Amino acid sequence: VLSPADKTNVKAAWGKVGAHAGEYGAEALERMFLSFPTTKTYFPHFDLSHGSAQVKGHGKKVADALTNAVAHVDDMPNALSALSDLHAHKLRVDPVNFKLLSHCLLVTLAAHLPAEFTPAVHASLDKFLASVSTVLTSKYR
Amino acid sequence: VLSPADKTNVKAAWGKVGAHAGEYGAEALERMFLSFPTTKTYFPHFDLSHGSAQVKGHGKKVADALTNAVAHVDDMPNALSALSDLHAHKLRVDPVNFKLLSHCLLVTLAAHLPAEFTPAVHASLDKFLASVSTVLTSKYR
Amino acid sequence: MHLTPEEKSAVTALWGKVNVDEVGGEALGRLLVVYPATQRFFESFGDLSTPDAVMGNPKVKAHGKKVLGAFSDGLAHLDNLKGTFATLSELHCDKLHVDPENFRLLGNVLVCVLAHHFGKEFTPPVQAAYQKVVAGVANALAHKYH
Amino acid sequence: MHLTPEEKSAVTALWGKVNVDEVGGEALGRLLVVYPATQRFFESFGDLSTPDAVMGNPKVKAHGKKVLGAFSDGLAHLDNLKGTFATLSELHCDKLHVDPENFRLLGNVLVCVLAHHFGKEFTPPVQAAYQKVVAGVANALAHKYH
Ligand code: HEM
Ligand code: HEM
Ligand code: HEM
Ligand code: HEM
């Protein structure tokens, strides 16, 4: 569960992400494709090369969804509802993959936000990405 | 998430288990311990030899908690609240282990209830054990 | 494949009694019914709208048989599952785009089917030996994913 | 452990810049803070109630150094991880009763910490090489569980 302190931590860190979000989501995806190749199976229709405009374009979409989750941190299950139907019922993405993307996001934020990624903030972000993953995954079978 | 047809399959399957539940619970633990040895790390204080008394006794424990969950299928979180705190906060059992016990329980039911373990009931028992697992680990961290 | 001699022998002796037409169809069918997500890979098989529809589908049954056919090969090559399954691996990855996490689901369904068919004879020790085999097969099938 | 020549160079190149005393502390400490369940194994370290209490605990810092050092040996023997870690495997299993799933958690927290320390330098390709290594080390630590 996201406690008050966690929400504050998440708002402050995503805040400092600002207009770089799109770029971070794109790096997170590239990191995931390279470190965990099984995830590419969900994107055979994508151009997966370094610099791919499809990957940047998508990274932006992933970051906007997270920004909207942060904006609706007290009602994530409803705010991400459409994205849950998409992932669980249409794309049918196995839940382990969410853990992999999440890990890759944390890696990206760590590499770009040295001063903000303290122990406490790292724990809050991990918790937040778990909450998002759980919502996107709850109807899956 | 359980459908009414699931609730019905679970009640009927479990109703047949009847007085065997305890023996079945113990068989399922013995299966888990031999098939997935890392689960033994949570039971260092137990005699784990074949047919041991603690296992047997513990098996009744687990089988009754499942019996109570079936009876309170519509209100699991409330009914299982004490076990959730025990597993998630006191014991701190990593969630992976729940899937391993669920599978062994399924195998046990499959091996003793030929007539009843149909494809539809198999699916319902699986969604059922997954819900129990979700409640028993909801707070783990 | 860290299989003790009494394990290899446990696996082998039981496999000799398997009716591959029954088990193969039951395992593939139970996968699609128990884990409906997997149905996206077989949309070309027809109607899989209900359990009965699924267990009766002749494309599900034939494919099930081929699947068990491949599993039999691995049992005869337990010492080199990797080499034995390299082509199938490349296929499930480059042509079919199957997330290897699904290989475990089929393995466990497969184990539940063996238990359903053999009852008392599918003792805990025999189960453990099959869990190792099924893990080894899953891993071999995932080896060439890139 | 499929490590190509370039992955191995990348890995080794980076490791020679790592201050072990310090990175070990950070990694074990971040582990106890982000995944609090892993505090069940260190009740003797005293106070772990808040982040400052954990990160600054001299016992946490000393143990982290210990862990990172064994991690180091591993890197000096990438081609025999199982042998290198065999005694530590048995110890974690028979005497400490640590569920191996915790080895993957530490491995990932360590990747985050490297990324934190090196920012830039920690390119995706370099991350990928480290993920194979942490997986390899966790599997080797898991090998002797029975
Ligand atoms: C933090 C978790 C994730 C979030 C917030 C997220 C968000 C999104 C968004 C915004 C879209 C575009 C929806 C649209 O069309 O407007 C999308 C689509 C998609 N996502 Fe996710 N995603 C997440 C995790 C994953 C993971 C783990 C996978 C699989 C490895 C995945 C695979 C896909 C695929 C295949 C599409 C469709 C892309 C296409 O064909 O255009 N996503 N996601
Ligand atoms: C179907 C899921 C499970 C259910 C319904 C269940 C139920 C129970 C019950 C009723 C108890 C006894 C509590 C008491 O005495 O008041 C218990 C204890 C315990 N459970 Fe579970 N359990 C489940 C899964 C697991 C798994 C996956 C693990 C880890 C492998 C585990 C490890 C333990 C341990 C170590 C104890 C304490 C045993 C002792 O010291 O006597 N449980 N559980
Ligand atoms: C248990 C491990 C598995 C083995 C040993 C296996 C084996 C095979 C074999 C022998 C074929 C026939 C290929 C040919 O001759 O051209 C095949 C095809 C196929 N496999 Fe698997 N398979 C496994 C698991 C899976 C899983 C889990 C899925 C997806 C959930 C899957 C999806 C497919 C699909 C969609 C085909 C093509 C069927 C067609 O031609 O329409 N397989 N597999
Ligand atoms: C990177 C993987 C790891 C390595 C290389 C490693 C290495 C070590 C070493 C060298 C020791 C000292 C052995 C001795 O006292 O003779 C140790 C002890 C210990 N390890 Fe690990 N370890 C790892 C992961 C873990 C994790 C994930 C846990 C549990 C969350 C853990 C739990 C413990 C505990 C409780 C001790 C004894 C501490 C004490 O002195 O009281 N280890 N480990």
PDB file of N, CA and C and ligand atoms in Angstrom, chain C residues 28 31-32 37-45 63 66-71 85 88 91-92 96 98-107 110 134 137-138 141, ligand 3:
ATOM      1  N   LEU C  28      -2.713 -30.312 -23.668  1.00  0.00           N
ATOM      2  CA  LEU C  28      -2.792 -29.094 -24.444  1.00  0.00           C
ATOM      3  C   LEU C  28      -4.131 -28.457 -24.198  1.00  0.00           C
ATOM      4  N   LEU C  31      -4.287 -26.684 -20.815  1.00  0.00           N
ATOM      5  CA  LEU C  31      -3.560 -25.415 -20.824  1.00  0.00           C
ATOM      6  C   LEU C  31      -4.450 -24.259 -21.283  1.00  0.00           C
ATOM      7  N   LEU C  32      -5.115 -24.447 -22.415  1.00  0.00           N
ATOM      8  CA  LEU C  32      -5.935 -23.403 -22.976  1.00  0.00           C
ATOM      9  C   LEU C  32      -7.145 -23.126 -22.116  1.00  0.00           C
ATOM     10  N   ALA C  37      -5.192 -17.233 -21.488  1.00  0.00           N
ATOM     11  CA  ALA C  37      -4.344 -16.289 -22.147  1.00  0.00           C
ATOM     12  C   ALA C  37      -3.645 -17.005 -23.278  1.00  0.00           C
ATOM     13  N   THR C  38      -3.219 -18.241 -23.036  1.00  0.00           N
ATOM     14  CA  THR C  38      -2.453 -18.964 -24.037  1.00  0.00           C
ATOM     15  C   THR C  38      -3.243 -19.193 -25.329  1.00  0.00           C
ATOM     16  N   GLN C  39      -4.537 -18.896 -25.329  1.00  0.00           N
ATOM     17  CA  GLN C  39      -5.343 -19.154 -26.504  1.00  0.00           C
ATOM     18  C   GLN C  39      -4.961 -18.250 -27.659  1.00  0.00           C
ATOM     19  N   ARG C  40      -4.251 -17.169 -27.392  1.00  0.00           N
ATOM     20  CA  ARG C  40      -3.932 -16.252 -28.469  1.00  0.00           C
ATOM     21  C   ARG C  40      -2.997 -16.854 -29.491  1.00  0.00           C
ATOM     22  N   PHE C  41      -2.260 -17.888 -29.123  1.00  0.00           N
ATOM     23  CA  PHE C  41      -1.295 -18.470 -30.054  1.00  0.00           C
ATOM     24  C   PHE C  41      -1.929 -19.492 -31.009  1.00  0.00           C
ATOM     25  N   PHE C  42      -3.126 -19.965 -30.663  1.00  0.00           N
ATOM     26  CA  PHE C  42      -3.821 -20.982 -31.442  1.00  0.00           C
ATOM     27  C   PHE C  42      -5.137 -20.461 -32.031  1.00  0.00           C
ATOM     28  N   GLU C  43      -5.256 -19.157 -32.241  1.00  0.00           N
ATOM     29  CA  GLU C  43      -6.507 -18.633 -32.784  1.00  0.00           C
ATOM     30  C   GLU C  43      -6.901 -19.395 -34.067  1.00  0.00           C
ATOM     31  N   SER C  44      -5.919 -19.823 -34.857  1.00  0.00           N
ATOM     32  CA  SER C  44      -6.172 -20.567 -36.086  1.00  0.00           C
ATOM     33  C   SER C  44      -6.676 -22.001 -35.882  1.00  0.00           C
ATOM     34  N   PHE C  45      -6.891 -22.417 -34.638  1.00  0.00           N
ATOM     35  CA  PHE C  45      -7.326 -23.780 -34.354  1.00  0.00           C
ATOM     36  C   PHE C  45      -8.838 -23.869 -34.366  1.00  0.00           C
ATOM     37  N   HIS C  63      -2.347 -31.572 -32.238  1.00  0.00           N
ATOM     38  CA  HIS C  63      -1.203 -30.772 -31.855  1.00  0.00           C
ATOM     39  C   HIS C  63      -0.641 -31.253 -30.515  1.00  0.00           C
ATOM     40  N   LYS C  66       1.665 -34.112 -31.042  1.00  0.00           N
ATOM     41  CA  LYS C  66       2.962 -33.717 -31.556  1.00  0.00           C
ATOM     42  C   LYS C  66       3.798 -33.185 -30.408  1.00  0.00           C
ATOM     43  N   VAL C  67       3.158 -32.419 -29.533  1.00  0.00           N
ATOM     44  CA  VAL C  67       3.851 -31.865 -28.386  1.00  0.00           C
ATOM     45  C   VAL C  67       4.391 -33.002 -27.527  1.00  0.00           C
ATOM     46  N   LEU C  68       3.573 -33.982 -27.207  1.00  0.00           N
ATOM     47  CA  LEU C  68       4.101 -35.072 -26.400  1.00  0.00           C
ATOM     48  C   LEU C  68       5.139 -35.833 -27.167  1.00  0.00           C
ATOM     49  N   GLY C  69       4.986 -35.887 -28.481  1.00  0.00           N
ATOM     50  CA  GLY C  69       5.990 -36.530 -29.296  1.00  0.00           C
ATOM     51  C   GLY C  69       7.345 -35.910 -29.062  1.00  0.00           C
ATOM     52  N   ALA C  70       7.415 -34.577 -29.000  1.00  0.00           N
ATOM     53  CA  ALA C  70       8.699 -33.883 -28.800  1.00  0.00           C
ATOM     54  C   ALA C  70       9.254 -34.110 -27.405  1.00  0.00           C
ATOM     55  N   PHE C  71       8.358 -34.182 -26.437  1.00  0.00           N
ATOM     56  CA  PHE C  71       8.733 -34.411 -25.054  1.00  0.00           C
ATOM     57  C   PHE C  71       9.379 -35.817 -24.914  1.00  0.00           C
ATOM     58  N   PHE C  85      16.552 -29.635 -28.448  1.00  0.00           N
ATOM     59  CA  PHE C  85      15.437 -28.704 -28.562  1.00  0.00           C
ATOM     60  C   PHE C  85      15.795 -27.360 -29.200  1.00  0.00           C
ATOM     61  N   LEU C  88      13.435 -26.213 -32.031  1.00  0.00           N
ATOM     62  CA  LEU C  88      12.108 -25.878 -31.531  1.00  0.00           C
ATOM     63  C   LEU C  88      12.153 -24.548 -30.811  1.00  0.00           C
ATOM     64  N   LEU C  91      12.315 -21.780 -33.225  1.00  0.00           N
ATOM     65  CA  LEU C  91      10.963 -21.614 -33.765  1.00  0.00           C
ATOM     66  C   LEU C  91       9.983 -20.869 -32.832  1.00  0.00           C
ATOM     67  N   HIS C  92       9.911 -21.270 -31.557  1.00  0.00           N
ATOM     68  CA  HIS C  92       8.959 -20.625 -30.631  1.00  0.00           C
ATOM     69  C   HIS C  92       9.337 -19.167 -30.380  1.00  0.00           C
ATOM     70  N   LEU C  96       7.074 -17.880 -33.708  1.00  0.00           N
ATOM     71  CA  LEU C  96       5.821 -17.816 -32.944  1.00  0.00           C
ATOM     72  C   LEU C  96       5.708 -16.708 -31.868  1.00  0.00           C
ATOM     73  N   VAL C  98       6.534 -16.679 -28.584  1.00  0.00           N
ATOM     74  CA  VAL C  98       6.003 -17.171 -27.325  1.00  0.00           C
ATOM     75  C   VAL C  98       6.912 -16.868 -26.145  1.00  0.00           C
ATOM     76  N   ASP C  99       6.397 -16.105 -25.201  1.00  0.00           N
ATOM     77  CA  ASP C  99       7.080 -15.802 -23.942  1.00  0.00           C
ATOM     78  C   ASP C  99       7.325 -17.109 -23.210  1.00  0.00           C
ATOM     79  N   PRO C 100       8.584 -17.448 -22.979  1.00  0.00           N
ATOM     80  CA  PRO C 100       8.958 -18.715 -22.371  1.00  0.00           C
ATOM     81  C   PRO C 100       8.317 -19.004 -21.017  1.00  0.00           C
ATOM     82  N   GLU C 101       7.768 -18.003 -20.356  1.00  0.00           N
ATOM     83  CA  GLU C 101       7.094 -18.199 -19.094  1.00  0.00           C
ATOM     84  C   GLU C 101       5.951 -19.169 -19.269  1.00  0.00           C
ATOM     85  N   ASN C 102       5.434 -19.258 -20.484  1.00  0.00           N
ATOM     86  CA  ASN C 102       4.348 -20.176 -20.762  1.00  0.00           C
ATOM     87  C   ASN C 102       4.792 -21.643 -20.795  1.00  0.00           C
ATOM     88  N   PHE C 103       6.080 -21.865 -21.031  1.00  0.00           N
ATOM     89  CA  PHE C 103       6.594 -23.227 -21.053  1.00  0.00           C
ATOM     90  C   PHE C 103       6.369 -23.891 -19.675  1.00  0.00           C
ATOM     91  N   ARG C 104       6.518 -23.121 -18.601  1.00  0.00           N
ATOM     92  CA  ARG C 104       6.299 -23.657 -17.259  1.00  0.00           C
ATOM     93  C   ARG C 104       4.856 -24.034 -17.022  1.00  0.00           C
ATOM     94  N   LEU C 105       3.935 -23.227 -17.522  1.00  0.00           N
ATOM     95  CA  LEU C 105       2.528 -23.544 -17.354  1.00  0.00           C
ATOM     96  C   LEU C 105       2.232 -24.882 -18.001  1.00  0.00           C
ATOM     97  N   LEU C 106       2.713 -25.090 -19.219  1.00  0.00           N
ATOM     98  CA  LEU C 106       2.434 -26.366 -19.883  1.00  0.00           C
ATOM     99  C   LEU C 106       3.070 -27.536 -19.111  1.00  0.00           C
ATOM    100  N   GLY C 107       4.247 -27.310 -18.545  1.00  0.00           N
ATOM    101  CA  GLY C 107       4.916 -28.353 -17.794  1.00  0.00           C
ATOM    102  C   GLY C 107       4.119 -28.790 -16.578  1.00  0.00           C
ATOM    103  N   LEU C 110       0.954 -30.519 -17.577  1.00  0.00           N
ATOM    104  CA  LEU C 110       1.374 -31.839 -17.965  1.00  0.00           C
ATOM    105  C   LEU C 110       1.533 -32.746 -16.738  1.00  0.00           C
ATOM    106  N   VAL C 134      10.547 -31.517 -16.506  1.00  0.00           N
ATOM    107  CA  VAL C 134       9.741 -30.478 -17.058  1.00  0.00           C
ATOM    108  C   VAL C 134      10.433 -29.121 -16.952  1.00  0.00           C
ATOM    109  N   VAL C 137      13.150 -29.154 -19.657  1.00  0.00           N
ATOM    110  CA  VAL C 137      12.614 -28.968 -20.991  1.00  0.00           C
ATOM    111  C   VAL C 137      12.274 -27.497 -21.220  1.00  0.00           C
ATOM    112  N   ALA C 138      11.602 -26.895 -20.245  1.00  0.00           N
ATOM    113  CA  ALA C 138      11.288 -25.473 -20.336  1.00  0.00           C
ATOM    114  C   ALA C 138      12.558 -24.659 -20.598  1.00  0.00           C
ATOM    115  N   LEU C 141      13.941 -25.222 -24.071  1.00  0.00           N
ATOM    116  CA  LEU C 141      13.138 -24.475 -25.032  1.00  0.00           C
ATOM    117  C   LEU C 141      13.388 -22.970 -25.013  1.00  0.00           C
TER     118      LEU C 141
HETATM  119  C1  HEM E   3       6.153 -27.696 -23.274  1.00  0.00           C
HETATM  120  C2  HEM E   3       7.031 -27.229 -24.140  1.00  0.00           C
HETATM  121  C3  HEM E   3       6.638 -27.168 -25.611  1.00  0.00           C
HETATM  122  C4  HEM E   3       7.084 -27.986 -26.543  1.00  0.00           C
HETATM  123  C5  HEM E   3       8.042 -29.178 -26.290  1.00  0.00           C
HETATM  124  C6  HEM E   3       6.486 -27.594 -27.799  1.00  0.00           C
HETATM  125  C7  HEM E   3       6.698 -28.211 -29.003  1.00  0.00           C
HETATM  126  C8  HEM E   3       6.178 -27.818 -30.205  1.00  0.00           C
HETATM  127  C9  HEM E   3       6.259 -28.566 -31.450  1.00  0.00           C
HETATM  128  C10 HEM E   3       6.925 -29.940 -31.682  1.00  0.00           C
HETATM  129  C11 HEM E   3       5.652 -27.857 -32.391  1.00  0.00           C
HETATM  130  C12 HEM E   3       5.474 -28.261 -33.879  1.00  0.00           C
HETATM  131  C13 HEM E   3       6.343 -27.368 -34.757  1.00  0.00           C
HETATM  132  C14 HEM E   3       6.459 -27.889 -36.175  1.00  0.00           C
HETATM  133  O1  HEM E   3       6.615 -29.129 -36.361  1.00  0.00           O
HETATM  134  O2  HEM E   3       6.422 -27.043 -37.110  1.00  0.00           O
HETATM  135  C15 HEM E   3       5.179 -26.643 -31.766  1.00  0.00           C
HETATM  136  C16 HEM E   3       4.501 -25.660 -32.410  1.00  0.00           C
HETATM  137  C17 HEM E   3       3.846 -24.633 -31.806  1.00  0.00           C
HETATM  138  N1  HEM E   3       3.978 -24.280 -30.471  1.00  0.00           N
HETATM  139 FE1  HEM E   3       4.931 -25.333 -28.966  1.00  0.00          FE
HETATM  140  N2  HEM E   3       5.725 -26.492 -27.576  1.00  0.00           N
HETATM  141  C18 HEM E   3       5.789 -26.208 -26.247  1.00  0.00           C
HETATM  142  C19 HEM E   3       5.128 -25.194 -25.641  1.00  0.00           C
HETATM  143  C20 HEM E   3       4.379 -24.239 -26.270  1.00  0.00           C
HETATM  144  C21 HEM E   3       3.623 -23.201 -25.605  1.00  0.00           C
HETATM  145  C22 HEM E   3       3.559 -23.011 -24.071  1.00  0.00           C
HETATM  146  C23 HEM E   3       3.040 -22.474 -26.533  1.00  0.00           C
HETATM  147  C24 HEM E   3       2.147 -21.258 -26.318  1.00  0.00           C
HETATM  148  C25 HEM E   3       1.436 -21.166 -25.191  1.00  0.00           C
HETATM  149  C26 HEM E   3       3.391 -23.035 -27.794  1.00  0.00           C
HETATM  150  C27 HEM E   3       2.993 -22.550 -29.007  1.00  0.00           C
HETATM  151  C28 HEM E   3       3.165 -23.190 -30.204  1.00  0.00           C
HETATM  152  C29 HEM E   3       2.473 -22.794 -31.401  1.00  0.00           C
HETATM  153  C30 HEM E   3       1.450 -21.636 -31.571  1.00  0.00           C
HETATM  154  C31 HEM E   3       2.916 -23.763 -32.475  1.00  0.00           C
HETATM  155  C32 HEM E   3       2.502 -23.814 -33.950  1.00  0.00           C
HETATM  156  C33 HEM E   3       1.253 -24.651 -34.071  1.00  0.00           C
HETATM  157  C34 HEM E   3       0.784 -24.574 -35.510  1.00  0.00           C
HETATM  158  O3  HEM E   3       1.538 -25.015 -36.413  1.00  0.00           O
HETATM  159  O4  HEM E   3      -0.319 -24.028 -35.737  1.00  0.00           O
HETATM  160  N3  HEM E   3       4.211 -24.112 -27.598  1.00  0.00           N
HETATM  161  N4  HEM E   3       5.495 -26.636 -30.433  1.00  0.00           N
END
